[PDB]
Design an enzyme around this catalytic site. Structure first.
Site, PDB file in Angstrom:
ATOM      1  N   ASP A  87       0.815  -1.206   0.000  1.00 59.55           N
ATOM      2  CA  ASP A  87       0.000   0.000   0.000  1.00 59.55           C
ATOM      3  C   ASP A  87       0.861   1.275   0.000  1.00 59.55           C
ATOM      4  O   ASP A  87       2.083   1.197   0.020  1.00 59.55           O
ATOM      5  CB  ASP A  87      -0.908  -0.010   1.231  1.00 59.55           C
ATOM      6  CG  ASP A  87      -0.238   0.168   2.588  1.00 59.55           C
ATOM      7  OD1 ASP A  87       0.986   0.555   2.639  1.00 59.55           O
ATOM      8  OD2 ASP A  87      -0.963   0.232   3.581  1.00 59.55           O
ATOM      9  N   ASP A  92       0.864   4.863   2.262  1.00 59.75           N
ATOM     10  CA  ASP A  92       0.333   5.533   3.431  1.00 59.75           C
ATOM     11  C   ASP A  92       0.769   6.964   3.501  1.00 59.75           C
ATOM     12  O   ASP A  92       1.891   7.291   3.142  1.00 59.75           O
ATOM     13  CB  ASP A  92       0.776   4.803   4.700  1.00 59.75           C
ATOM     14  CG  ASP A  92       0.459   3.324   4.743  1.00 59.75           C
ATOM     15  OD1 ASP A  92      -0.553   2.913   4.133  1.00 59.75           O
ATOM     16  OD2 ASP A  92       1.211   2.584   5.400  1.00 59.75           O
ATOM     17  N   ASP A 100      -3.771   4.406   2.371  1.00 62.36           N
ATOM     18  CA  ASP A 100      -4.274   4.778   3.692  1.00 62.36           C
ATOM     19  C   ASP A 100      -3.945   6.227   3.970  1.00 62.36           C
ATOM     20  O   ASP A 100      -2.828   6.653   3.718  1.00 62.36           O
ATOM     21  CB  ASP A 100      -3.713   3.892   4.798  1.00 62.36           C
ATOM     22  CG  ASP A 100      -3.955   2.419   4.595  1.00 62.36           C
ATOM     23  OD1 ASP A 100      -5.016   2.062   4.068  1.00 62.36           O
ATOM     24  OD2 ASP A 100      -3.086   1.625   4.980  1.00 62.36           O
TER      25      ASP A 100
HETATM   26  N1  LIG Z   1      -3.935   0.955  12.521  1.00 67.41           N
HETATM   27  C1  LIG Z   1      -2.608   1.336  12.747  1.00 67.41           C
HETATM   28  N2  LIG Z   1      -2.253   1.973  13.910  1.00 67.41           N
HETATM   29  C2  LIG Z   1      -0.986   2.383  14.188  1.00 67.41           C
HETATM   30  N3  LIG Z   1       0.002   2.186  13.321  1.00 67.41           N
HETATM   31  C3  LIG Z   1      -0.235   1.568  12.118  1.00 67.41           C
HETATM   32  C4  LIG Z   1      -1.582   1.108  11.787  1.00 67.41           C
HETATM   33  N4  LIG Z   1      -1.537   0.549  10.558  1.00 67.41           N
HETATM   34  C5  LIG Z   1      -0.286   0.631  10.123  1.00 67.41           C
HETATM   35  N5  LIG Z   1       0.584   1.245  11.038  1.00 67.41           N
HETATM   36  C6  LIG Z   1       2.044   1.550  10.977  1.00 67.41           C
HETATM   37  O1  LIG Z   1       2.469   2.260   9.786  1.00 67.41           O
HETATM   38  C7  LIG Z   1       3.404   1.438   9.032  1.00 67.41           C
HETATM   39  C8  LIG Z   1       2.712   1.112   7.720  1.00 67.41           C
HETATM   40  O2  LIG Z   1       1.637   0.184   7.944  1.00 67.41           O
HETATM   41  P1  LIG Z   1       1.520  -0.941   6.840  1.00 67.41           P
HETATM   42  O3  LIG Z   1       1.229  -0.162   5.438  1.00 67.41           O
HETATM   43  O4  LIG Z   1       0.320  -1.759   7.180  1.00 67.41           O
HETATM   44  C9  LIG Z   1       3.136  -1.814   6.779  1.00 67.41           C
HETATM   45  P2  LIG Z   1       4.585  -0.972   5.878  1.00 67.41           P
HETATM   46  O5  LIG Z   1       5.617  -0.601   7.072  1.00 67.41           O
HETATM   47  O6  LIG Z   1       4.119   0.273   5.228  1.00 67.41           O
HETATM   48  O7  LIG Z   1       5.174  -2.046   4.722  1.00 67.41           O
HETATM   49  P3  LIG Z   1       4.016  -2.436   3.560  1.00 67.41           P
HETATM   50  O8  LIG Z   1       3.055  -1.120   3.220  1.00 67.41           O
HETATM   51  O9  LIG Z   1       4.492  -3.033   2.280  1.00 67.41           O
HETATM   52  O10 LIG Z   1       3.054  -3.644   4.196  1.00 67.41           O
HETATM   53  C10 LIG Z   1       3.579   0.105   9.786  1.00 67.41           C
HETATM   54  O11 LIG Z   1       4.810  -0.636   9.494  1.00 67.41           O
HETATM   55  C11 LIG Z   1       3.135   0.456  11.232  1.00 67.41           C
HETATM   56  O12 LIG Z   1       4.242   1.042  11.927  1.00 67.41           O
HETATM   57 MG   LIG Z   2       2.522   0.529   4.164  1.00 67.08          MG
HETATM   58 ZN   LIG Z   3      -0.949   0.968   5.431  1.00 68.98          ZN
END
Ligand SMILES: Nc1ncnc2c1ncn2[C@@H]1O[C@H](COP(=O)(O)CP(=O)(O)OP(=O)(O)O)[C@@H](O)[C@H]1O
Ligand SMILES: [Mg+2]
Ligand SMILES: [Zn+2]
Ligand code: NA
Length: 357
Positions: A195, A197, A281
């Site tokens: 994703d 963010d 997100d």
């Molecule tokens: N509901 C939530 N509440 C608090 N922190 C969150 C969260 N959802 C995600 N995060 C945080 O924000 C970072 C990004 O979330 P994710 O997108 O789900 C994993 P990522 O670190 O971005 O690798 P990825 O996007 O390939 O899976 C996470 O690694 C975590 O620290």
């Molecule tokens: Mg992410």
């Molecule tokens: Zn995310």
């Protein structure tokens, strides 16, 4: 001496121990699926510390002085040194429950409980799940199946940048002073992600303006024909509540989980339908909490867990995505940047690309 805390280690994407950590990550994931939280945590901490090493483990002697390496973990490392493979991780990859849980949760909207339900119904393939005439799917799962191939192909940096442009263009239309930052894995230097963010904040917006932005931006995209999926979680943020005591802290800010239509023409890369579904997100936070939210949303998950554990156990401080509280001084600590949070904690600053724990 290597610290047991990821927040006191620099973990870059040049992993010299991928043979060990890929096997430990599989074993940790299986323990999560088998609801063995303890064994899961032990494998996650071992994998994390090896990711921080500036050299590859080539003998058992190389593991001397490395913390978080218990006897079970050392047997797994020994086995990989012996023939370049983990017999334990190989067995997990061939396990029917593990294969089903990985495959089913790879669908947006499917978690551990739905994956377990489908497995105990005798389902093993996504084709058999989708074509079943008795199964009922949530709106999230319907989107997960409809845009499956796009969502499973992981998002690259030209696509993440193209999404950033779309987010910024939409956001400044309603809040021109808003600050939009790409967080998660891409902020830590990753080439790909599942994703994209973003953290959005505005120094002059009111409480109501802050609340309405995600609704205005998603309605604008709905009008444009770009909103494929949208779930907005209203804020439950409390300005004067103490930070979380939980191992894995919950985020109370207003946020939305989206699927956007990304037209090929918007992507400036080296290289079908002419568009790609992208998981996005968006998090909206109050301006004064922007440093805490950025630090929490940058991750990695293991870096965040160890930051909060170090704050509690070593500094008698309480940290989460919204604030930092000093239990000895009985005061909330203010921060305008991540650097100030690290300084409050007595930690050397770890750059975002060094937080890949
Ligand atoms: N509901 C939530 N509440 C608090 N922190 C969150 C969260 N959802 C995600 N995060 C945080 O924000 C970072 C990004 O979330 P994710 O997108 O789900 C994993 P990522 O670190 O971005 O690798 P990825 O996007 O390939 O899976 C996470 O690694 C975590 O620290
Ligand atoms: Mg992410
Ligand atoms: Zn995310
Ligand atoms: Na899922």
């Amino acid at each position: 001496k290597i610290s047991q805390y990821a927040c006191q280690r620099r973990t870059t994407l040049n992993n010299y121990n991928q043979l060990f950590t890929d096997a430990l990550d599989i074993l940790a994931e299986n323990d999560e699926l088998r609801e063995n939280e303890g064994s899961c945590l032990a494998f996650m901490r071992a994998s994390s510390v090896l990711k921080s090493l500036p050299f590859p483990i080539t003998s058992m002697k190389d593991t001397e002085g490395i913390p978080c390496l218990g006897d079970k973990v050392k047997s797994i490392i020994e086995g990989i040194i012996e023939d370049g493979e983990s017999s334990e991780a190989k067995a997990v990859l061939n396990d029917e429950r593990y294969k089903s849980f990985k495959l089913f949760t790879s669908v947006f909207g499917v978690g551990l409980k739905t994956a377990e339900k489908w497995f105990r119904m005798g389902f093993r393939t996504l084709s058999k799940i989708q074509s079943d005439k008795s199964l009922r799917f949530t709106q999230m799962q319907k989107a997960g199946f409809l845009y499956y191939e796009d969502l499973v192909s992981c998002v690259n940096r030209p696509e993440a940048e193209a999404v950033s442009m779309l987010v910024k263009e939409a956001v400044v239309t309603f809040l021109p002073d808003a600050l939009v930052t790409m967080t998660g894995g891409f902020r830590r230097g990753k080439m790909t992600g599942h994703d994209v963010d973003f953290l959005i904040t505005s120094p002059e917006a009111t409480e109501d303006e802050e609340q309405q932005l995600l609704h205005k931006v998603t309605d604008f995209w709905k009008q444009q024909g770009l909103l494929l999926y949208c779930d907005i979680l209203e804020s439950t943020f409390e300005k004067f509540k103490q930070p979380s005591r939980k191992v894995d802290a919950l985020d109370h800010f207003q946020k939305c989980f989206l699927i956007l239509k990304l037209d090929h023409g918007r992507v400036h890369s080296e290289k079908g339908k002419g568009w790609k579904a992208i998981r996005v997100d968006l998090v909206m936070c109050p301006y004064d909490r922007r440093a805490f939210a950025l630090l929490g949303w940058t991750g990695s998950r293991q870096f965040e867990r160890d930051l909060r554990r170090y704050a509690t156990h070593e500094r008698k401080m309480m940290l989460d995505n919204h604030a930092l509280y000093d239990r000895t001084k009985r005061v909330f600590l203010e921060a305008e940047s991540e650097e100030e949070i690290f300084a409050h904690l007595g930690l050397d600053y770890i750059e975002p690309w060094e937080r890949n724990a």
